[PDB]
Amino acid sequence: SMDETVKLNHTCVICDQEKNRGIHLYTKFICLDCERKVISTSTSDPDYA
């Protein structure tokens, strides 16, 4: 096992904080808060032109 960084409280790829609640795409972890933040940030699909 030398690829995926698991850890007990997975460190938030965003917050840099060790959290046990969130998701994991590849080997990383977006904390559940950021995980919702993202959905909330992406709400700008159209451009400003």
Residue 10 sits in the site that holds Zn ion (CB under 5 A): no
Among 11, 14, 24, 28, binds Zn ion (CB under 5 A): 14
Closest approach of Cβ 33 to Zn ion, in Å? 5
Mind spelling out the 3-state secondary structure of 1-45?
A: CCCCCCCCCEECCCCCCEECCEECCCCCCEEHHHHHHHHHHCCCC
Closest approach of Cβ 1 to Zn ion, in Å? 22
- CA 5 to CA 27: how far, in whole Å? 6
Q: Judge whether 20 is annotated as a binding position.
A: no
Question: Between 25 and 49, whose beta carbon lies closer to a copy of itself?
Answer: 25
